[PDB]
Motif scaffolding. Sequence first.
Motif, PDB file in Angstrom:
ATOM      1  N   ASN A   1       6.145   1.124   8.676  1.00 44.11           N
ATOM      2  CA  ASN A   1       6.562   2.209   9.550  1.00 44.11           C
ATOM      3  C   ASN A   1       6.910   1.522  10.873  1.00 44.11           C
ATOM      4  O   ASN A   1       6.010   1.006  11.534  1.00 44.11           O
TER       5      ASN A   1
ATOM      6  N   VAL B   1       0.603   5.152  -6.556  1.00 45.91           N
ATOM      7  CA  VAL B   1      -0.449   4.647  -7.429  1.00 45.91           C
ATOM      8  C   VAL B   1      -0.262   3.169  -7.755  1.00 45.91           C
ATOM      9  O   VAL B   1      -1.146   2.500  -8.291  1.00 45.91           O
ATOM     10  N   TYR B   2       0.934   2.635  -7.492  1.00 44.47           N
ATOM     11  CA  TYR B   2       1.180   1.209  -7.604  1.00 44.47           C
ATOM     12  C   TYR B   2       0.744   0.466  -6.348  1.00 44.47           C
ATOM     13  O   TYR B   2       0.836   1.024  -5.249  1.00 44.47           O
TER      14      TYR B   2
ATOM     15  N   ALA C   1       1.039  -6.805  11.757  1.00 44.62           N
ATOM     16  CA  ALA C   1       0.787  -6.450  10.375  1.00 44.62           C
ATOM     17  C   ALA C   1      -0.084  -5.220  10.208  1.00 44.62           C
ATOM     18  O   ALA C   1      -0.734  -4.782  11.155  1.00 44.62           O
ATOM     19  N   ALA C   2      -0.135  -4.587   9.056  1.00 47.85           N
ATOM     20  CA  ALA C   2      -1.059  -3.470   8.853  1.00 47.85           C
ATOM     21  C   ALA C   2      -2.073  -3.869   7.788  1.00 47.85           C
ATOM     22  O   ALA C   2      -2.096  -3.327   6.687  1.00 47.85           O
ATOM     23  N   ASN C   3      -2.922  -4.866   8.098  1.00 50.79           N
ATOM     24  CA  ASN C   3      -3.842  -5.467   7.139  1.00 50.79           C
ATOM     25  C   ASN C   3      -3.056  -6.051   5.949  1.00 50.79           C
ATOM     26  O   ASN C   3      -1.821  -6.168   6.008  1.00 50.79           O
ATOM     27  N   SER C   4      -3.655  -6.451   4.844  1.00 48.83           N
ATOM     28  CA  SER C   4      -2.886  -6.881   3.688  1.00 48.83           C
ATOM     29  C   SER C   4      -3.489  -6.438   2.363  1.00 48.83           C
ATOM     30  O   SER C   4      -4.706  -6.302   2.210  1.00 48.83           O
ATOM     31  N   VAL C   5      -2.643  -6.202   1.360  1.00 51.63           N
ATOM     32  CA  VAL C   5      -3.103  -5.738   0.052  1.00 51.63           C
ATOM     33  C   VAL C   5      -3.266  -6.821  -1.004  1.00 51.63           C
ATOM     34  O   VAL C   5      -2.440  -7.725  -1.141  1.00 51.63           O
ATOM     35  N   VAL C   6      -4.355  -6.776  -1.744  1.00 54.11           N
ATOM     36  CA  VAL C   6      -4.562  -7.610  -2.916  1.00 54.11           C
ATOM     37  C   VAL C   6      -4.463  -6.680  -4.124  1.00 54.11           C
ATOM     38  O   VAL C   6      -5.366  -5.885  -4.409  1.00 54.11           O
TER      39      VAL C   6
ATOM     40  N   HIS D   1       0.833  -1.218  -2.981  1.00 48.98           N
ATOM     41  CA  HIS D   1       1.898  -1.017  -2.001  1.00 48.98           C
ATOM     42  C   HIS D   1       1.456  -1.097  -0.545  1.00 48.98           C
ATOM     43  O   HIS D   1       0.279  -0.942  -0.238  1.00 48.98           O
ATOM     44  N   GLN D   2       2.435  -1.177   0.338  1.00 50.38           N
ATOM     45  CA  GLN D   2       2.239  -0.997   1.771  1.00 50.38           C
ATOM     46  C   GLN D   2       3.416  -0.227   2.360  1.00 50.38           C
ATOM     47  O   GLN D   2       4.438  -0.017   1.697  1.00 50.38           O
ATOM     48  N   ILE D   3       3.296   0.297   3.565  1.00 49.36           N
ATOM     49  CA  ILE D   3       4.421   0.944   4.216  1.00 49.36           C
ATOM     50  C   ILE D   3       4.746   0.232   5.523  1.00 49.36           C
ATOM     51  O   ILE D   3       3.878  -0.034   6.349  1.00 49.36           O
TER      52      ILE D   3
ATOM     53  N   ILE E   1       5.338  -3.087  -8.687  1.00 47.13           N
ATOM     54  CA  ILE E   1       5.195  -2.412  -9.979  1.00 47.13           C
ATOM     55  C   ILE E   1       5.055  -3.330 -11.191  1.00 47.13           C
ATOM     56  O   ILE E   1       5.957  -4.125 -11.454  1.00 47.13           O
TER      57      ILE E   1
ATOM     58  N   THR F   1       4.591   1.292  13.870  1.00 45.89           N
ATOM     59  CA  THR F   1       3.298   0.706  13.543  1.00 45.89           C
ATOM     60  C   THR F   1       3.299  -0.767  13.164  1.00 45.89           C
ATOM     61  O   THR F   1       2.435  -1.526  13.603  1.00 45.89           O
ATOM     62  N   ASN F   2       4.238  -1.251  12.335  1.00 42.87           N
ATOM     63  CA  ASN F   2       4.198  -2.632  11.890  1.00 42.87           C
ATOM     64  C   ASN F   2       5.491  -3.390  11.556  1.00 42.87           C
ATOM     65  O   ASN F   2       6.449  -2.809  11.065  1.00 42.87           O
TER      66      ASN F   2
END
Lengths: 266, 266, 62, 62, 59, 4, 4, 279
Positions: free
Chosen positions: B193, B186-187, B23-28, B189-191, B122, B196-197
Amino acid sequence: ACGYSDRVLQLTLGNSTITTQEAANSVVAYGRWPEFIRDDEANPVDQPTEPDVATCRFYTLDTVMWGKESKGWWWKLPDALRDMGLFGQNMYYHYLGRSGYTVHVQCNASKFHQGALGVFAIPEYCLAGDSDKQRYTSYANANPGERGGKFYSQFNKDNAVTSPKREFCPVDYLLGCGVLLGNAFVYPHQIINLRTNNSATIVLPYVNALAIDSMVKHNNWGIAILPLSPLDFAQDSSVEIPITVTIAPMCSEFNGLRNVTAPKFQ
Amino acid sequence: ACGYSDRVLQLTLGNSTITTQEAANSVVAYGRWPEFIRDDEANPVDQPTEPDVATCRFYTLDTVMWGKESKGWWWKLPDALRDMGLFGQNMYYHYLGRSGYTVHVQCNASKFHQGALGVFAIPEYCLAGDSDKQRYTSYANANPGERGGKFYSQFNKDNAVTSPKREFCPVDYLLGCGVLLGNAFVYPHQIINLRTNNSATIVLPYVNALAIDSMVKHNNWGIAILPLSPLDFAQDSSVEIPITVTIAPMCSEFNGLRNVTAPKFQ
Amino acid sequence: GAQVSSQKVGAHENSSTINYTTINYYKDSASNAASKQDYSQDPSKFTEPLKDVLIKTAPALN
Amino acid sequence: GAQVSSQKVGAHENSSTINYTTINYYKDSASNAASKQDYSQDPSKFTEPLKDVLIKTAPALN
Amino acid sequence: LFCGSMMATGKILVAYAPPGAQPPTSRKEAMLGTHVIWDLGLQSSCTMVVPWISNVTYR
Amino acid sequence: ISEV
Amino acid sequence: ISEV
Amino acid sequence: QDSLPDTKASGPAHSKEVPALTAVETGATNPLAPSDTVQTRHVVQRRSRSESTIESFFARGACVAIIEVDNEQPTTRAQKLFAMWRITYKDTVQLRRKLELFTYSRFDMELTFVVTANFTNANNGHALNQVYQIMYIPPGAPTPKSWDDYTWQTSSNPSIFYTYGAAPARISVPYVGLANAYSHFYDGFAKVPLKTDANDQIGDSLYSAMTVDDFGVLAVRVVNDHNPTKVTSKVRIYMKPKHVRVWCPRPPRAVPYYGPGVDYRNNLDPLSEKGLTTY
Ligand SMILES: CCOC(=O)c1ccc(OCCCC2CCN(c3ccc(C)nn3)CC2)cc1
Ligand SMILES: *C(=O)CCCCCCCCCCCCC
Ligand SMILES: *C(=O)CCCCCCCCCCCCC
């Protein structure tokens, strides 16, 4: 004080309210109010689903007509409620389910009408069948759903050995199960005697040998309604009045979630 | 201490657990965890339904295939989950529903594979349509359910005036809504790639101008997945790898119970 | 009910702290002018929405 | 003779209690604007004009 | 208010369905929403409260 | 003044 | 007055 | 004080801390300052972000509407003796794009009305000064059918009576939304089509549209009875959002607007040509 009475009650569960101006007090089966499975009596280790107001509320079944020829009606729980809103969905999406019930039977008439209905709540209401064949009543037949089943004044043996009907043949004076109706009063019950009351209200605990079980495989309670005294009015030899059954699940909880159970009812 | 990492996570909701070793950390989203409607922000006065573990759990949607020609995929919430188990039932039996979500997008490949997916969450993802006709996209078309919708490299105007298709025509570099894709960052998000993940994990709060709303009439969040960098492998000019989207409702609550909503999806 | 605040003085005459006075003449707050004294905030909810926000001198991926 | 009261603030700027000031310029009270700070009352004289007002959980007719 | 004769009896179901589904054509559907089962008797009248259930703060 |  |  | 952070004096580095390297896949913007990758001096920073506060960004009167109304002899064919306008920021593009950098908003509104007039024809005598009535008609209220029918009695609707030549008329409006915030975008419908419906027109709605009238209309008329000679007038409405709050940022509109929704039709090519290695 003020003017409160045994006869006038209001029952409110979820977004449903029942009023009755002519009740004969109300029964709590075996002196036990419905309650949830306590940790020291728990058996499935998984966090339960408790749907609360969405399922614990008043579902009214299809009305039946009481006439001079009516021998009696019966229902099983949870089966009668299997298609009732979100209760039904929860029941079929989970291997396990337990629930108590408030049962409200309704039958009004007039000061000049006559008759008496015996309303009985029976734990494990095992019924007798069709045939020479023992324990042969099919699942689809043992389970009428909302529709319920009926009683008979006498035993007609299903004769067609070649294509057996596989139905119950419940004789009224034998409580459909080989015992005498007069002793059915040892079961939690009320009587709707038309000169005395419009309705019956019986609160039912979850009763079983287990803290929780398969609602699809096993019915816990049976509701049997029989004319203890036949319907009569003035001289009109073909009188008919409605009986309406309304039931609410209480303290409902479910365990063992997975894909939905789709029973073959044909 | 011991050996804990940004890359290795376990997510557990209800009877569902997800593991990820890359994983590439996580978004809240917006720094806000999902929470229930507080009394001082409440609007419908009726006691809510909170189905908890039966609905707040991981529903996996149908897998899509990422190939060299893939322009992008999109989903709307709650719509993608409308048929997912007990969540769907609760959604359609109640006028009102609010819910947050944990979104987990999955796409593994190999040390020798190449490409990058932009995963965007979004608020109010209003999409553009077919025609000369403004604001004409039909309900059935605006709502693909689990299936989702797709993106296009260019705008083809639905020409048949006589029998209009009434669909969205979402052009990829315009984020399907008239703005440039590069600013979609600006929304929340994660990528993904591929070097990388394996995956993306975005936790979503309920976002709306109201504390609660009609889930059937209005989608709160849109999940847009686009190839920021195209899929590539060794020299095989026709590579194809799966993308799997798994979503969990969080802190779900419902108000306004009645008979079930049956939308016409044809 | 007079309201008194300090102006942020840009170009200064060859003459310290300068003030201005405000009075609301209407009962409805909508009718009021804009205060323009506004508080700023962290970009964080936008620039760093991470569950485990990491420090810039450390590896982003660990 | 200035009169000072608090506005009920609906939409708030990104900037608490806000006030407004009133002064009567005329001797005749008729000339005055409306205060609009008004007291509300019981519907009872209309909704329950009973000699013996009874409590809602009890029978209306006894 | 029931303006029938005192010798007349009856039980009625009055209900409210919050918006979004098919408007009830049968008691069966109506039962599932907010409802009061009114029993006719000495207390002549019955009140059903339609609770404020809305998405918007003001309709 | 009369601040109310 | 309210001097801020 | 609202000045920005001072630049810190930063020297050479040979270390295991690597601020320059990162991973955008996480979803985060790397928080670097010049001192993280170059040697910097100490700067006492005096600059401020005062003019980019939300209030400051919107604190300006924008033209949202040109309502044309005529004062002339009531003939028997379609005239402009009175006019109506649906209140919206969307008939114009400039303010619409600024507000649309955000999904949700809350604000009070200032409406300022500039009223200009002129003579249509070479000459039929002249006109005495005109008074204009601007009546707000909230959704539900009776709409005018004629320039002087009973609706203009305005007994409960708010009306402005503007005198020509006077300083431009001005009013303030509260936050009047049905929700806790104005939705600049609505991914939804006002109706759902159901399987049990008779026609399928019954459940049909416009995509992204909420209420039919949404905020109501402004009805404009010249209160003056007509001169022999005709006078054409135009009311220019300028709106300013004040005491503003905004939520959830959005990408700016990149291609031309095609009506009230997010739809695009043409000039989908905003970007110029420029060679990859050309400064
Ligand atoms: C999507 C459309 O645009 C908006 O979202 C939007 C646009 C404008 C806005 O202002 C509220 C609109 C209603 C107001 C506008 C004008 N009003 C009045 C009232 C009285 C008079 C004389 N003149 N105007 C009172 C009500 C609020 C929101
Ligand atoms: C607080 O405001 C008390 C001091 C008032 C000083 C004189 C104010 C003169 C302007 C009053 C405007 C009244 C508007 C109705
Ligand atoms: C109480 O009002 C004393 C304070 C007065 C402050 C200045 C008021 C200025 C306006 C006075 C109007 C006089 C009208 C004849």
